[PDB]
């Protein structure tokens, strides 16, 4: 194989073209360029392979410059579900396959473009008894940062995107709670 170098991570918005560049300057004559895609909680899957000429299929395009010392994976109009690790592999193939070195690849994040941001913090009571509650920060735009809790007794989750698909509606949220009653949802994400 030839050693590949690619960015550790990348950010994007739903609907855009995503381009991931891989560097492989010691590529040899009988090497091919292969990319795999790994969705959360799954193993990687093969998505595209090339030699010297542009390749396009249902999942991606692969551009290969004349010197073959780098290549670019182009993902079309990305969806939230394209949040995944993308691996660039360079080496011999078919009957002459030896091994892959996956490394860490490129972690791609895909954010929703929120149509009508409507940020709000809500308080929710336990169905079993309103002894416990949680705070919900929801409907904010995707550039809004949600900070981790600096306090050991307060829990604040990362943001999560849900998709009400029949309504063509997506929304961001984060949840916060504490093992104390005095906890105010008002300052929780503040």
């Amino acid at each position: 194989l030839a050693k590949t170098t690619q960015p550790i991570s990348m950010d994007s918005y739903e609907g855009q073209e995503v381009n991931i560049t891989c560097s492989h300057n010691n590529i040899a004559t009988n090497d091919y360029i292969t990319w795999y895609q790994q969705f959360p909680s799954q193993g990687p899957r093969f998505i595209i392979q090339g030699y010297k000429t542009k390749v396009t299929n249902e999942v991606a395009s692969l551009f290969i410059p004349a010197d073959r010392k780098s290549s670019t994976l182009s993902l079309p109009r990305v969806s939230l579900s394209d949040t995944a690790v993308y691996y660039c592999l360079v080496g011999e193939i078919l009957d002459n396959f030896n091994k892959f070195y996956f490394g860490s690849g490129t972690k791609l994040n895909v954010k929703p473009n929120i149509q009508n941001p409507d940020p709000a913090v809500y308080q929710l009571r336990d169905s079993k008894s309103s002894d416990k509650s949680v705070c919900l920060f929801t409907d904010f735009d995707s550039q809004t940062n949600v900070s981790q809790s600096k306090d050991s007794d307060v829990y604040i989750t990362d943001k999560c995107v849900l998709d009400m698909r029949s309504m063509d509606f997506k929304s961001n949220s984060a949840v916060a709670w504490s093992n104390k009653s005095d906890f105010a949802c008002a300052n929780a994400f503040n």
């Binding site: 009957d95 091994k99 409507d118 929710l124 336990d126 079993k128």
Partner: protein
């Protein structure tokens, strides 16, 4: 189709552990990898045919067997906590070796002791009236708390059928005691429905948490219930 024998495993330090990779595609090539934070996907061992084996990049602590074409066994002769990982196998045909088909993954957690294994407690938090009024939508929140190790799968069930639309579950759990090495975990999820759907008392909403814990062969001596593999849920009916 590539099968792995288990989805989750809890094992003790010093125990002999087997993970099976099975395929019936008559593939010549089979592979075992592990996947860790910051370290990506690393090759442990592979096999180009029946009774063949070759060490990968990180073979230390592992062995394998390939007695039958369909099965590639990963063997941990004496499990250690550093072997806690996500294990992924794959296979490929000899003439298409570079096209590897991966199994679904096996989470193995090795513990020195089973003392600190805990199932989740589960609670459902009912939608805010302020959200209902302002948006005509209604977000239920579920918390799975106090579980150890990080072996849960959370799902939502509405009127007895699993739902996916309107759901988001945290990709990663939070540590309840971040400074403690064997801190128990918490995980949250949201299910968002139309307000009028929540307002129907005939609608049943369940947050269901599968925990992968102890089995019958694990000993248990504490007074509290043995933290076996189990399904723990919390629920709410709709309200007007």
């Amino acid at each position: 189709k590539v099968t792995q024998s288990s989805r989750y495993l809890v094992k003790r330090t010093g125990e002999k552990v087997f993970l099976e990779c099975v395929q019936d595609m008559d593939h010549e090539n089979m592979f075992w990898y592990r996947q860790d934070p910051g370290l990506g996907l690393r090759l442990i061992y592979f096999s180009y045919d029946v009774k063949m084996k070759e060490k990968g990049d990180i073979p230390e602590g592992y062995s394998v067997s390939r007695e039958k074409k369909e099965r590639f066994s990963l063997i941990l002769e004496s499990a250690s906590t550093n072997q806690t990982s996500m294990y992924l196998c794959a296979s490929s045909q000899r003439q298409e070796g570079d096209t590897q088909y991966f199994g679904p993954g096996t989470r193995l957690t090795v513990l020195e002791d089973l003392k600190n294994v805990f199932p989740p407690e589960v609670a459902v938090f009912e939608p805010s009236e302020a959200e209902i009024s302002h948006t005509q939508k209604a977000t239920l929140v579920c918390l799975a708390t106090g579980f150890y190790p990080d072996h849960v799968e959370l799902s939502w069930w509405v009127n007895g059928k699993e739902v996916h639309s309107g759901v988001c579950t945290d990709p990663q759990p939070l540590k309840e005691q971040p400074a403690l090495n064997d801190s128990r975990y918490a995980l949250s999820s949201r299910l968002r429905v139309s307000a009028t759907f929540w307002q129907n008392p005939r609608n049943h909403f369940r947050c269901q948490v599968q925990f992968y814990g102890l089995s019958e062969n694990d000993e248990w001596t504490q007074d509290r219930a043995k933290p076996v593999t189990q399904i723990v849920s919390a629920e709410a009916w709709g309200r007007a």
